[PDB]
Amino acid sequence: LQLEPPTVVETLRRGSKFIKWDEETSSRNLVTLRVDPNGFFLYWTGPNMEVDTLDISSIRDTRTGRYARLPKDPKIREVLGFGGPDARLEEKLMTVVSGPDPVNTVFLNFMAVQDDTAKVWSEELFKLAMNILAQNASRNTFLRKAYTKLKLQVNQDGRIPVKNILKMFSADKKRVETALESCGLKFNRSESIRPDEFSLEIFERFLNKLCLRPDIDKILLEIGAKGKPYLTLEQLMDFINQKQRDPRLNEVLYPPLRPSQARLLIEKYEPNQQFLERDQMSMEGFSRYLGGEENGILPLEALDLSTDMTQPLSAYFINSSHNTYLTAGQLAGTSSVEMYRQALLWGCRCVELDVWKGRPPEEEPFITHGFTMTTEVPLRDVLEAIAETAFKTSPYPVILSFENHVDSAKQQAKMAEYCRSIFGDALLIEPLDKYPLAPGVPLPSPQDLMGRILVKNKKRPTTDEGTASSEVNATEEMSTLVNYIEPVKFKSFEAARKRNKCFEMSSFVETKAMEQLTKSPMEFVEYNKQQLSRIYPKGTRVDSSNYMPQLFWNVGCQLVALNFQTLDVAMQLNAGVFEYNGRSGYLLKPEFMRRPDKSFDPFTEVIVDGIVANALRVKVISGQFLSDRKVGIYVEVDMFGLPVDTRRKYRTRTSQGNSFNPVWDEEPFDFPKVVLPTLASLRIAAFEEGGKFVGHRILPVSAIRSGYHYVCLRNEANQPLCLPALLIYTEASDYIPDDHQDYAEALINPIKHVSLMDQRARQLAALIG
């Protein structure tokens, strides 16, 4: 049991009874909550008799019980029965948080009818929203989602209205009317089709007639299909073993496609028994295989938590946040307890806490940005929220980065209690017996600290370094919890490295860290091998803007912190790279960046010894369903890795005009020399004319397959977008230098090289001897 298809159990199918309630509109409506069989949508009958559907892939978290949201209007409380008899009313509360990004999130609150119906729902609906296969699924599946939506959103008379479709694919109107009439489904009378004569197959033939695909036909003509109609079983098998394979992988570990296997593909994909009976696959069945479950762009092994988790903590990149309490601009904006929950739900493992003194009347430490017109959320509420959602997305260690300004043993002792009171066993009060806190003793692995929390405080005003400069002196209470992550002031690499303590670590502001990158880079890597290093953004960035974290990953920095508030290019990448290794937020560094004996220069302009460098070619072919409106689209293709690898210049032309089914015939975007592929990452992104964002995707250079594939696009917070998707061709291969082509050839088949050259020296002999 690694990754399982998101099965929706019995209760969720037919659905139990609930009470939806709203505060600002004072609503209290009954609703029969239902999730469809394939696990696409959560729908119910609305108050208007409208079918209001909710996208499951946009669920961020589902809260149950005491952790669920409670009403804050007096009259709403009483009408639910909170001023009533039973202490049972919490056991039926369920709050479903939804949204595209963590800043903008609407809350849907519910109340159950039966005892414990609410409990089982929360946790089962949660596993749907955060399933891996569900999110990374095929192109086939993503269309069915589109079909499921149209079938669900029915009008008063229980029918699928005409305009529903015209506004979904609003990239055309005139065509769509001819396409539905071609299907024979009468929309002419009352502009609404019945759900009976709108089966999955009818929706299929609809798009085949509406969406004309010339690109797929050129690709048919290539693979020996000059006799156009069909493809033989051999043509298909050979096509997969020459194009669709990844030539980097071994032949014995990953074997080619056998003929008996290729048969099962035809059976699953070809609808005509006219062609399935003959061991052939039509154009219609090929269009499906391209978007099928086997022919994805990425392999499953990439998305799965299948990276080693036993290496030292320092040998991993870690997903990290800066000033996580803030939800807007760094200055006058507001703070929120909720952002800490959302942060840890992302996959983040390091979160910052700028705690402060209390007030004279009471005595509660609170969190906020050092006097700067920010709202002041309390400490207890934050710690409790962390204690909830810390180990929901990922069961791997979390780092509470305490930026202490509490200047009294009175209230500083109080936060020592709050930690032990709230977290309890999860808090790592003392060291492990295997790894003590000695010089030379390496950091424990992520697996050695599964489900544990580590405090980051001292033990025993600056223009651009912020409130992190003048941090207060830690006291004897708080210092007890600190152990494996000890922040100390940095002197120099030799000093802190020859000291030979591993648990010790120093934080770096963006600008000071930047100079160390330029002035002494190899020295940085060899510090990061042993010890830890945090990197937070400078104080100049007053609008919560982000620096490029790839900069510092190149030299082996673990905690490259960012502003989760904004989702710019930088955060778009941080989001999409930690998706891998099963959303764990722990990505294992490339061999040489964490090996003591090896040492390489991050700036090398030539291949490194030992490191198997790769060569990548990306040709953009076409796209489908890229807009709710006729408008031009253009595609960008960028690579982020070492500076030597990093290019972000390539861009397609603006499309003819069609945002429905545009096709680009363009020169492939070449990345001929990728020195360190294990670190580097490809990035396809689609835009409208005048820079309007549509959908991007981050792909690792290491795992990306070669051949014709669809690339299911995502929003800025790497959530799966339904309709939009590109068709691209790829060629990831092992790098052979230009000078050593023929040399590399001999090795691959020396039976021919020996022979064909020996033969020469033999038949040349009678001329000399």
Binding site: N250, V252, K598, V612, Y735, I748, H753
Partner: protein, 337 residues
Amino acid sequence: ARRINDEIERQLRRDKRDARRELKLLLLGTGESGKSTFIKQMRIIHGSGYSDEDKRGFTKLVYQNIFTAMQAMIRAMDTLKIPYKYEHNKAHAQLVREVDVEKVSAFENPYVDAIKSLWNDPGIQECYDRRREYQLSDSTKYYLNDLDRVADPSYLPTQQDVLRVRVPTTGIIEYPFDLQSVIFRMVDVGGQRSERRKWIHCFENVTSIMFLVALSEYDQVLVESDNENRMEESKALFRTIITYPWFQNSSVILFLNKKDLLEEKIMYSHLVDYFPEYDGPQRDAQAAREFILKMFVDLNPDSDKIIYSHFTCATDTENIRFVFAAVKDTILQLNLK
């Protein structure tokens, strides 16, 4: 005057450590020539030996070797149309086929009894003799003999058992070893055709080339291409690497490995069959070895490159100490002077 003179010796200890140089050795070869099994032995002798924690790391793979070795066995019963003798093995045979190879951690009643049963079938044993026709790992015979020890609930494989496991190497990994007076950086690489394209990335600053051939390859065919002889690839893949400009002032060491299996396979399969121009006796342990040795040493374009060659057995720990002691000297005396 003890603690002061203590840290004078500790200084002079770390003196020799950092002051000695390291030499980069490449372990090259065709598929399954026994290259990784060699490194394991170097780890046994001059590296970190195998702890009981480490020995149970492979206990999962030892099970998967039995299934992969048995799954491929049962397919050959259909390939070659070999009939089963006992018919109650047909129920067990269907059961083993349909087991996934990848997800196998346990080893229990449902299958242990079944696999035992299949190994005693005459049709299956007749199949083992004809294993030169399909692809089947050499360690198969070792493991299926002692299925009883493996079936045990508290089974922990010995060091011998961990040499025999079949885990195919991919890419380029660099295992260093300290031999007191000098460090040996030993690069292990993949053997199959896909993996040879990669090799290029580790040829710079090479001191020596420990090439590895398997003697018992002479009748078998490549897994990567079922239309060619394995020994003929080794022969040609050697020829290639000797020509290369890279390795001009590099020593060449030819390990003729799997010598034990040559004495077994010679007493029924003949060398005269697959390499015609062999004038020596048939069923020959000795001269059949010697004809192979000279076959490689005569493919030498450099008339001055003296190719230092040893026959070896990669699963024997005590054969490698002898062979590597001499190879250690041959190397050191060619670089230091």
